[PDB]
PDB file of all heavy atoms in Angstrom:
ATOM      1  N   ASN Q   1     111.034 146.735  45.027  1.00 51.61           N
ATOM      2  CA  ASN Q   1     112.062 147.239  44.128  1.00 51.61           C
ATOM      3  C   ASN Q   1     111.482 148.443  43.397  1.00 51.61           C
ATOM      4  O   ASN Q   1     110.429 148.338  42.760  1.00 51.61           O
ATOM      5  CB  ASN Q   1     112.504 146.144  43.154  1.00 51.61           C
ATOM      6  CG  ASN Q   1     113.611 146.590  42.210  1.00 51.61           C
ATOM      7  OD1 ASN Q   1     113.761 147.771  41.908  1.00 51.61           O
ATOM      8  ND2 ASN Q   1     114.398 145.630  41.739  1.00 51.61           N
ATOM      9  N   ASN Q   2     112.164 149.584  43.494  1.00 50.19           N
ATOM     10  CA  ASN Q   2     111.781 150.786  42.767  1.00 50.19           C
ATOM     11  C   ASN Q   2     112.661 151.041  41.549  1.00 50.19           C
ATOM     12  O   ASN Q   2     112.758 152.186  41.093  1.00 50.19           O
ATOM     13  CB  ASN Q   2     111.806 151.994  43.703  1.00 50.19           C
ATOM     14  CG  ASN Q   2     111.065 151.741  45.001  1.00 50.19           C
ATOM     15  OD1 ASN Q   2     109.953 151.214  45.001  1.00 50.19           O
ATOM     16  ND2 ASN Q   2     111.681 152.114  46.116  1.00 50.19           N
ATOM     17  N   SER Q   3     113.304 150.007  41.013  1.00 51.56           N
ATOM     18  CA  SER Q   3     114.255 150.168  39.925  1.00 51.56           C
ATOM     19  C   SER Q   3     114.001 149.123  38.848  1.00 51.56           C
ATOM     20  O   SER Q   3     113.382 148.084  39.088  1.00 51.56           O
ATOM     21  CB  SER Q   3     115.701 150.058  40.426  1.00 51.56           C
ATOM     22  OG  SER Q   3     116.084 148.702  40.568  1.00 51.56           O
ATOM     23  N   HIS Q   4     114.494 149.419  37.647  1.00 50.09           N
ATOM     24  CA  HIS Q   4     114.445 148.497  36.520  1.00 50.09           C
ATOM     25  C   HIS Q   4     115.514 147.414  36.586  1.00 50.09           C
ATOM     26  O   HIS Q   4     115.614 146.610  35.653  1.00 50.09           O
ATOM     27  CB  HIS Q   4     114.569 149.274  35.208  1.00 50.09           C
ATOM     28  CG  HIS Q   4     113.511 150.318  35.026  1.00 50.09           C
ATOM     29  ND1 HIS Q   4     113.562 151.546  35.650  1.00 50.09           N
ATOM     30  CD2 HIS Q   4     112.370 150.314  34.297  1.00 50.09           C
ATOM     31  CE1 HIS Q   4     112.501 152.255  35.310  1.00 50.09           C
ATOM     32  NE2 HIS Q   4     111.762 151.531  34.489  1.00 50.09           N
ATOM     33  N   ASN Q   5     116.311 147.377  37.647  1.00 51.78           N
ATOM     34  CA  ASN Q   5     117.314 146.343  37.848  1.00 51.78           C
ATOM     35  C   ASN Q   5     116.716 145.136  38.564  1.00 51.78           C
ATOM     36  O   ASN Q   5     115.636 145.201  39.155  1.00 51.78           O
ATOM     37  CB  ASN Q   5     118.497 146.888  38.650  1.00 51.78           C
ATOM     38  CG  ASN Q   5     119.138 148.096  37.998  1.00 51.78           C
ATOM     39  OD1 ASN Q   5     119.339 148.127  36.784  1.00 51.78           O
ATOM     40  ND2 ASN Q   5     119.462 149.100  38.803  1.00 51.78           N
ATOM     41  N   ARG Q   6     117.445 144.025  38.508  1.00 49.97           N
ATOM     42  CA  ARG Q   6     117.092 142.806  39.222  1.00 49.97           C
ATOM     43  C   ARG Q   6     118.111 142.593  40.330  1.00 49.97           C
ATOM     44  O   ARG Q   6     119.321 142.631  40.082  1.00 49.97           O
ATOM     45  CB  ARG Q   6     117.068 141.592  38.292  1.00 49.97           C
ATOM     46  CG  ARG Q   6     116.677 140.303  38.997  1.00 49.97           C
ATOM     47  CD  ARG Q   6     116.595 139.130  38.036  1.00 49.97           C
ATOM     48  NE  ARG Q   6     117.886 138.804  37.465  1.00 49.97           N
ATOM     49  CZ  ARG Q   6     118.826 138.054  38.023  1.00 49.97           C
ATOM     50  NH1 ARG Q   6     119.279 138.311  39.238  1.00 49.97           N
ATOM     51  NH2 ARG Q   6     119.486 137.182  37.266  1.00 49.97           N
ATOM     52  N   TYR Q   7     117.623 142.366  41.546  1.00 50.81           N
ATOM     53  CA  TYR Q   7     118.477 142.252  42.718  1.00 50.81           C
ATOM     54  C   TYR Q   7     118.345 140.889  43.380  1.00 50.81           C
ATOM     55  O   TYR Q   7     117.281 140.268  43.359  1.00 50.81           O
ATOM     56  CB  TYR Q   7     118.159 143.346  43.741  1.00 50.81           C
ATOM     57  CG  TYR Q   7     118.372 144.751  43.229  1.00 50.81           C
ATOM     58  CD1 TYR Q   7     117.332 145.666  43.206  1.00 50.81           C
ATOM     59  CD2 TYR Q   7     119.612 145.158  42.757  1.00 50.81           C
ATOM     60  CE1 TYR Q   7     117.522 146.951  42.741  1.00 50.81           C
ATOM     61  CE2 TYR Q   7     119.814 146.444  42.297  1.00 50.81           C
ATOM     62  CZ  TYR Q   7     118.764 147.335  42.289  1.00 50.81           C
ATOM     63  OH  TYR Q   7     118.952 148.613  41.817  1.00 50.81           O
ATOM     64  N   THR Q   8     119.451 140.426  43.953  1.00 52.03           N
ATOM     65  CA  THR Q   8     119.442 139.317  44.893  1.00 52.03           C
ATOM     66  C   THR Q   8     119.856 139.835  46.264  1.00 52.03           C
ATOM     67  O   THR Q   8     120.797 140.625  46.386  1.00 52.03           O
ATOM     68  CB  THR Q   8     120.375 138.187  44.447  1.00 52.03           C
ATOM     69  OG1 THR Q   8     121.732 138.646  44.465  1.00 52.03           O
ATOM     70  CG2 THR Q   8     120.016 137.722  43.045  1.00 52.03           C
ATOM     71  N   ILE Q   9     119.141 139.380  47.287  1.00 47.27           N
ATOM     72  CA  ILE Q   9     119.235 139.892  48.647  1.00 47.27           C
ATOM     73  C   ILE Q   9     119.367 138.701  49.582  1.00 47.27           C
ATOM     74  O   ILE Q   9     118.616 137.726  49.454  1.00 47.27           O
ATOM     75  CB  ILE Q   9     118.004 140.742  49.014  1.00 47.27           C
ATOM     76  CG1 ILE Q   9     117.859 141.923  48.052  1.00 47.27           C
ATOM     77  CG2 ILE Q   9     118.102 141.235  50.435  1.00 47.27           C
ATOM     78  CD1 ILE Q   9     116.712 142.847  48.387  1.00 47.27           C
ATOM     79  N   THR Q  10     120.306 138.776  50.522  1.00 48.26           N
ATOM     80  CA  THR Q  10     120.282 137.890  51.680  1.00 48.26           C
ATOM     81  C   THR Q  10     119.831 138.661  52.911  1.00 48.26           C
ATOM     82  O   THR Q  10     120.417 139.693  53.255  1.00 48.26           O
ATOM     83  CB  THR Q  10     121.659 137.268  51.919  1.00 48.26           C
ATOM     84  OG1 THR Q  10     122.018 136.457  50.794  1.00 48.26           O
ATOM     85  CG2 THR Q  10     121.635 136.398  53.162  1.00 48.26           C
ATOM     86  N   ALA Q  11     118.804 138.138  53.584  1.00 49.39           N
ATOM     87  CA  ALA Q  11     118.191 138.783  54.733  1.00 49.39           C
ATOM     88  C   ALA Q  11     118.152 137.843  55.928  1.00 49.39           C
ATOM     89  O   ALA Q  11     118.084 136.624  55.780  1.00 49.39           O
ATOM     90  CB  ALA Q  11     116.765 139.249  54.412  1.00 49.39           C
ATOM     91  N   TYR Q  12     118.222 138.430  57.115  1.00 48.55           N
ATOM     92  CA  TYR Q  12     118.293 137.705  58.370  1.00 48.55           C
ATOM     93  C   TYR Q  12     117.251 138.293  59.307  1.00 48.55           C
ATOM     94  O   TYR Q  12     117.082 139.519  59.377  1.00 48.55           O
ATOM     95  CB  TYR Q  12     119.686 137.789  59.005  1.00 48.55           C
ATOM     96  CG  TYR Q  12     120.823 137.648  58.020  1.00 48.55           C
ATOM     97  CD1 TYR Q  12     121.312 138.749  57.332  1.00 48.55           C
ATOM     98  CD2 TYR Q  12     121.413 136.413  57.787  1.00 48.55           C
ATOM     99  CE1 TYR Q  12     122.334 138.620  56.419  1.00 48.55           C
ATOM    100  CE2 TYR Q  12     122.450 136.279  56.889  1.00 48.55           C
ATOM    101  CZ  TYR Q  12     122.905 137.385  56.206  1.00 48.55           C
ATOM    102  OH  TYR Q  12     123.950 137.259  55.321  1.00 48.55           O
ATOM    103  N   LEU Q  13     116.566 137.408  60.027  1.00 47.71           N
ATOM    104  CA  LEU Q  13     115.703 137.759  61.146  1.00 47.71           C
ATOM    105  C   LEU Q  13     116.353 137.265  62.429  1.00 47.71           C
ATOM    106  O   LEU Q  13     116.657 136.072  62.553  1.00 47.71           O
ATOM    107  CB  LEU Q  13     114.312 137.148  60.975  1.00 47.71           C
ATOM    108  CG  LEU Q  13     113.361 137.247  62.169  1.00 47.71           C
ATOM    109  CD1 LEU Q  13     112.883 138.676  62.371  1.00 47.71           C
ATOM    110  CD2 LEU Q  13     112.184 136.303  61.989  1.00 47.71           C
ATOM    111  N   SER Q  14     116.553 138.177  63.374  1.00 49.77           N
ATOM    112  CA  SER Q  14     116.918 137.846  64.746  1.00 49.77           C
ATOM    113  C   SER Q  14     115.783 138.249  65.677  1.00 49.77           C
ATOM    114  O   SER Q  14     115.378 139.415  65.692  1.00 49.77           O
ATOM    115  CB  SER Q  14     118.211 138.560  65.140  1.00 49.77           C
ATOM    116  OG  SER Q  14     118.469 138.421  66.526  1.00 49.77           O
ATOM    117  N   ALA Q  15     115.264 137.295  66.449  1.00 52.51           N
ATOM    118  CA  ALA Q  15     114.207 137.568  67.412  1.00 52.51           C
ATOM    119  C   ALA Q  15     114.733 137.313  68.817  1.00 52.51           C
ATOM    120  O   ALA Q  15     115.217 136.215  69.112  1.00 52.51           O
ATOM    121  CB  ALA Q  15     112.982 136.701  67.124  1.00 52.51           C
ATOM    122  N   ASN Q  16     114.641 138.325  69.675  1.00 52.03           N
ATOM    123  CA  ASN Q  16     115.236 138.317  71.003  1.00 52.03           C
ATOM    124  C   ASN Q  16     114.163 138.564  72.052  1.00 52.03           C
ATOM    125  O   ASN Q  16     113.260 139.379  71.847  1.00 52.03           O
ATOM    126  CB  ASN Q  16     116.337 139.375  71.119  1.00 52.03           C
ATOM    127  CG  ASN Q  16     117.480 139.132  70.157  1.00 52.03           C
ATOM    128  OD1 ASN Q  16     118.437 138.428  70.476  1.00 52.03           O
ATOM    129  ND2 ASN Q  16     117.385 139.713  68.967  1.00 52.03           N
ATOM    130  N   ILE Q  17     114.250 137.856  73.169  1.00 52.31           N
ATOM    131  CA  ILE Q  17     113.503 138.241  74.362  1.00 52.31           C
ATOM    132  C   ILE Q  17     114.300 139.315  75.088  1.00 52.31           C
ATOM    133  O   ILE Q  17     115.508 139.165  75.305  1.00 52.31           O
ATOM    134  CB  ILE Q  17     113.234 137.016  75.248  1.00 52.31           C
ATOM    135  CG1 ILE Q  17     112.132 136.173  74.603  1.00 52.31           C
ATOM    136  CG2 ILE Q  17     112.862 137.434  76.660  1.00 52.31           C
ATOM    137  CD1 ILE Q  17     112.063 134.771  75.082  1.00 52.31           C
ATOM    138  N   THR Q  18     113.634 140.410  75.465  1.00 49.78           N
ATOM    139  CA  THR Q  18     114.324 141.524  76.101  1.00 49.78           C
ATOM    140  C   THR Q  18     113.553 142.043  77.304  1.00 49.78           C
ATOM    141  O   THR Q  18     112.333 141.894  77.399  1.00 49.78           O
ATOM    142  CB  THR Q  18     114.565 142.699  75.129  1.00 49.78           C
ATOM    143  OG1 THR Q  18     113.395 143.524  75.065  1.00 49.78           O
ATOM    144  CG2 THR Q  18     114.929 142.214  73.735  1.00 49.78           C
ATOM    145  N   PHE Q  19     114.298 142.638  78.232  1.00 46.40           N
ATOM    146  CA  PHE Q  19     113.717 143.503  79.244  1.00 46.40           C
ATOM    147  C   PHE Q  19     113.149 144.752  78.571  1.00 46.40           C
ATOM    148  O   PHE Q  19     113.505 145.087  77.438  1.00 46.40           O
ATOM    149  CB  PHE Q  19     114.794 143.894  80.258  1.00 46.40           C
ATOM    150  CG  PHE Q  19     114.311 143.992  81.673  1.00 46.40           C
ATOM    151  CD1 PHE Q  19     113.984 142.854  82.389  1.00 46.40           C
ATOM    152  CD2 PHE Q  19     114.219 145.222  82.301  1.00 46.40           C
ATOM    153  CE1 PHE Q  19     113.554 142.944  83.695  1.00 46.40           C
ATOM    154  CE2 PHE Q  19     113.790 145.317  83.608  1.00 46.40           C
ATOM    155  CZ  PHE Q  19     113.456 144.179  84.305  1.00 46.40           C
ATOM    156  N   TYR Q  20     112.244 145.445  79.270  1.00 46.10           N
ATOM    157  CA  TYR Q  20     111.645 146.629  78.660  1.00 46.10           C
ATOM    158  C   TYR Q  20     112.677 147.718  78.407  1.00 46.10           C
ATOM    159  O   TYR Q  20     112.436 148.612  77.588  1.00 46.10           O
ATOM    160  CB  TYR Q  20     110.512 147.183  79.531  1.00 46.10           C
ATOM    161  CG  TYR Q  20     110.963 147.964  80.745  1.00 46.10           C
ATOM    162  CD1 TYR Q  20     110.976 149.352  80.726  1.00 46.10           C
ATOM    163  CD2 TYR Q  20     111.342 147.324  81.915  1.00 46.10           C
ATOM    164  CE1 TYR Q  20     111.377 150.078  81.823  1.00 46.10           C
ATOM    165  CE2 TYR Q  20     111.766 148.045  83.014  1.00 46.10           C
ATOM    166  CZ  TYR Q  20     111.776 149.422  82.963  1.00 46.10           C
ATOM    167  OH  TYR Q  20     112.156 150.152  84.064  1.00 46.10           O
ATOM    168  N   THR Q  21     113.816 147.665  79.100  1.00 46.05           N
ATOM    169  CA  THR Q  21     114.988 148.490  78.834  1.00 46.05           C
ATOM    170  C   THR Q  21     115.691 148.131  77.531  1.00 46.05           C
ATOM    171  O   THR Q  21     116.700 148.763  77.202  1.00 46.05           O
ATOM    172  CB  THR Q  21     115.974 148.381  79.997  1.00 46.05           C
ATOM    173  OG1 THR Q  21     116.333 147.008  80.190  1.00 46.05           O
ATOM    174  CG2 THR Q  21     115.348 148.910  81.274  1.00 46.05           C
ATOM    175  N   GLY Q  22     115.192 147.145  76.789  1.00 44.31           N
ATOM    176  CA  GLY Q  22     115.813 146.711  75.558  1.00 44.31           C
ATOM    177  C   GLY Q  22     117.039 145.840  75.726  1.00 44.31           C
ATOM    178  O   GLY Q  22     117.631 145.436  74.718  1.00 44.31           O
ATOM    179  N   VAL Q  23     117.440 145.537  76.957  1.00 40.75           N
ATOM    180  CA  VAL Q  23     118.542 144.613  77.219  1.00 40.75           C
ATOM    181  C   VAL Q  23     118.108 143.201  76.844  1.00 40.75           C
ATOM    182  O   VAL Q  23     117.151 142.673  77.427  1.00 40.75           O
ATOM    183  CB  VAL Q  23     118.995 144.688  78.685  1.00 40.75           C
ATOM    184  CG1 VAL Q  23     120.116 143.699  78.948  1.00 40.75           C
ATOM    185  CG2 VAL Q  23     119.439 146.097  79.026  1.00 40.75           C
ATOM    186  N   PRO Q  24     118.773 142.552  75.893  1.00 40.93           N
ATOM    187  CA  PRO Q  24     118.347 141.216  75.473  1.00 40.93           C
ATOM    188  C   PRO Q  24     118.801 140.131  76.434  1.00 40.93           C
ATOM    189  O   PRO Q  24     119.808 140.259  77.134  1.00 40.93           O
ATOM    190  CB  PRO Q  24     119.022 141.053  74.106  1.00 40.93           C
ATOM    191  CG  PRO Q  24     120.279 141.839  74.242  1.00 40.93           C
ATOM    192  CD  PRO Q  24     119.917 143.035  75.101  1.00 40.93           C
ATOM    193  N   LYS Q  25     118.028 139.047  76.462  1.00 41.39           N
ATOM    194  CA  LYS Q  25     118.339 137.880  77.278  1.00 41.39           C
ATOM    195  C   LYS Q  25     118.642 136.629  76.468  1.00 41.39           C
ATOM    196  O   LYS Q  25     119.605 135.924  76.774  1.00 41.39           O
ATOM    197  CB  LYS Q  25     117.181 137.588  78.242  1.00 41.39           C
ATOM    198  CG  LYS Q  25     117.094 136.139  78.689  1.00 41.39           C
ATOM    199  CD  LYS Q  25     116.022 135.945  79.744  1.00 41.39           C
ATOM    200  CE  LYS Q  25     116.533 135.104  80.900  1.00 41.39           C
ATOM    201  NZ  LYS Q  25     117.490 135.866  81.750  1.00 41.39           N
ATOM    202  N   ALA Q  26     117.856 136.339  75.433  1.00 42.36           N
ATOM    203  CA  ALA Q  26     118.044 135.136  74.634  1.00 42.36           C
ATOM    204  C   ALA Q  26     117.535 135.384  73.222  1.00 42.36           C
ATOM    205  O   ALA Q  26     116.518 136.055  73.033  1.00 42.36           O
ATOM    206  CB  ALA Q  26     117.322 133.935  75.255  1.00 42.36           C
ATOM    207  N   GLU Q  27     118.244 134.834  72.238  1.00 39.83           N
ATOM    208  CA  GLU Q  27     117.771 134.810  70.855  1.00 39.83           C
ATOM    209  C   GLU Q  27     116.861 133.608  70.627  1.00 39.83           C
ATOM    210  O   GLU Q  27     117.330 132.496  70.379  1.00 39.83           O
ATOM    211  CB  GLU Q  27     118.964 134.765  69.906  1.00 39.83           C
ATOM    212  CG  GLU Q  27     118.617 134.628  68.438  1.00 39.83           C
ATOM    213  CD  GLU Q  27     119.390 135.586  67.561  1.00 39.83           C
ATOM    214  OE1 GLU Q  27     120.499 136.000  67.956  1.00 39.83           O
ATOM    215  OE2 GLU Q  27     118.887 135.919  66.473  1.00 39.83           O
ATOM    216  N   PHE Q  28     115.547 133.823  70.733  1.00 37.04           N
ATOM    217  CA  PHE Q  28     114.613 132.703  70.715  1.00 37.04           C
ATOM    218  C   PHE Q  28     114.349 132.186  69.303  1.00 37.04           C
ATOM    219  O   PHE Q  28     113.929 131.034  69.150  1.00 37.04           O
ATOM    220  CB  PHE Q  28     113.308 133.054  71.447  1.00 37.04           C
ATOM    221  CG  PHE Q  28     112.397 133.997  70.712  1.00 37.04           C
ATOM    222  CD1 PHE Q  28     111.432 133.516  69.842  1.00 37.04           C
ATOM    223  CD2 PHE Q  28     112.458 135.359  70.945  1.00 37.04           C
ATOM    224  CE1 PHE Q  28     110.577 134.378  69.188  1.00 37.04           C
ATOM    225  CE2 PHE Q  28     111.605 136.225  70.296  1.00 37.04           C
ATOM    226  CZ  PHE Q  28     110.661 135.733  69.418  1.00 37.04           C
ATOM    227  N   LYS Q  29     114.582 133.002  68.274  1.00 36.31           N
ATOM    228  CA  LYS Q  29     114.413 132.568  66.893  1.00 36.31           C
ATOM    229  C   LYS Q  29     115.422 133.268  65.991  1.00 36.31           C
ATOM    230  O   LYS Q  29     115.711 134.455  66.165  1.00 36.31           O
ATOM    231  CB  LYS Q  29     112.987 132.842  66.400  1.00 36.31           C
ATOM    232  CG  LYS Q  29     112.688 132.289  65.017  1.00 36.31           C
ATOM    233  CD  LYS Q  29     111.240 132.524  64.629  1.00 36.31           C
ATOM    234  CE  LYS Q  29     110.883 131.765  63.364  1.00 36.31           C
ATOM    235  NZ  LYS Q  29     111.092 130.300  63.520  1.00 36.31           N
ATOM    236  N   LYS Q  30     115.958 132.519  65.030  1.00 37.20           N
ATOM    237  CA  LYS Q  30     116.855 133.052  64.014  1.00 37.20           C
ATOM    238  C   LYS Q  30     116.499 132.443  62.667  1.00 37.20           C
ATOM    239  O   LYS Q  30     116.301 131.229  62.569  1.00 37.20           O
ATOM    240  CB  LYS Q  30     118.318 132.753  64.360  1.00 37.20           C
ATOM    241  CG  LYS Q  30     119.319 133.276  63.348  1.00 37.20           C
ATOM    242  CD  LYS Q  30     120.725 133.281  63.923  1.00 37.20           C
ATOM    243  CE  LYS Q  30     121.108 131.910  64.457  1.00 37.20           C
ATOM    244  NZ  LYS Q  30     121.321 130.922  63.363  1.00 37.20           N
ATOM    245  N   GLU Q  31     116.414 133.282  61.635  1.00 38.80           N
ATOM    246  CA  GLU Q  31     115.974 132.822  60.324  1.00 38.80           C
ATOM    247  C   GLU Q  31     116.764 133.540  59.237  1.00 38.80           C
ATOM    248  O   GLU Q  31     117.238 134.661  59.434  1.00 38.80           O
ATOM    249  CB  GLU Q  31     114.461 133.049  60.152  1.00 38.80           C
ATOM    250  CG  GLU Q  31     113.907 132.750  58.772  1.00 38.80           C
ATOM    251  CD  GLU Q  31     113.050 131.503  58.740  1.00 38.80           C
ATOM    252  OE1 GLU Q  31     113.045 130.757  59.741  1.00 38.80           O
ATOM    253  OE2 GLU Q  31     112.383 131.268  57.710  1.00 38.80           O
ATOM    254  N   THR Q  32     116.881 132.891  58.076  1.00 37.25           N
ATOM    255  CA  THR Q  32     117.550 133.452  56.910  1.00 37.25           C
ATOM    256  C   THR Q  32     116.664 133.306  55.679  1.00 37.25           C
ATOM    257  O   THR Q  32     116.023 132.269  55.481  1.00 37.25           O
ATOM    258  CB  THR Q  32     118.906 132.769  56.670  1.00 37.25           C
ATOM    259  OG1 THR Q  32     119.741 132.945  57.820  1.00 37.25           O
ATOM    260  CG2 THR Q  32     119.607 133.364  55.461  1.00 37.25           C
ATOM    261  N   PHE Q  33     116.635 134.355  54.856  1.00 36.64           N
ATOM    262  CA  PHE Q  33     115.846 134.422  53.635  1.00 36.64           C
ATOM    263  C   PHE Q  33     116.746 134.797  52.467  1.00 36.64           C
ATOM    264  O   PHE Q  33     117.598 135.682  52.590  1.00 36.64           O
ATOM    265  CB  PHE Q  33     114.733 135.479  53.724  1.00 36.64           C
ATOM    266  CG  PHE Q  33     113.992 135.496  55.028  1.00 36.64           C
ATOM    267  CD1 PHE Q  33     114.408 136.321  56.060  1.00 36.64           C
ATOM    268  CD2 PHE Q  33     112.870 134.711  55.216  1.00 36.64           C
ATOM    269  CE1 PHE Q  33     113.729 136.351  57.259  1.00 36.64           C
ATOM    270  CE2 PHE Q  33     112.183 134.739  56.412  1.00 36.64           C
ATOM    271  CZ  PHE Q  33     112.613 135.562  57.434  1.00 36.64           C
ATOM    272  N   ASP Q  34     116.561 134.122  51.338  1.00 36.82           N
ATOM    273  CA  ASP Q  34     117.149 134.548  50.075  1.00 36.82           C
ATOM    274  C   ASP Q  34     116.028 135.056  49.181  1.00 36.82           C
ATOM    275  O   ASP Q  34     115.053 134.339  48.936  1.00 36.82           O
ATOM    276  CB  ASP Q  34     117.896 133.398  49.397  1.00 36.82           C
ATOM    277  CG  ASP Q  34     119.097 132.933  50.194  1.00 36.82           C
ATOM    278  OD1 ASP Q  34     120.036 133.735  50.380  1.00 36.82           O
ATOM    279  OD2 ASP Q  34     119.101 131.766  50.638  1.00 36.82           O
TER     280      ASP Q  34
END
């Protein structure tokens, strides 16, 4: 935080197995952070 304010954030992680072309095949992990 670069501000004098207080923030609440919802964040998501999506982890995908992909071909080297970046084409995804499966979402092997999904996570949520507050």
Side-chain angles (χ1 to χ4, degrees):
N1 182 334
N2 311 314
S3 81
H4 302 79
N5 303 317
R6 181 177 65 83
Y7 299 121
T8 65
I9 301 183
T10 297
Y12 318 86
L13 171 71
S14 171
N16 298 271
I17 285 161
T18 84
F19 217 72
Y20 77 100
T21 57
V23 179
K25 155 174 226 73
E27 175 134 26
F28 73 90
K29 186 177 190 59
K30 180 165 54 71
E31 174 109 349
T32 301
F33 317 92
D34 295 297

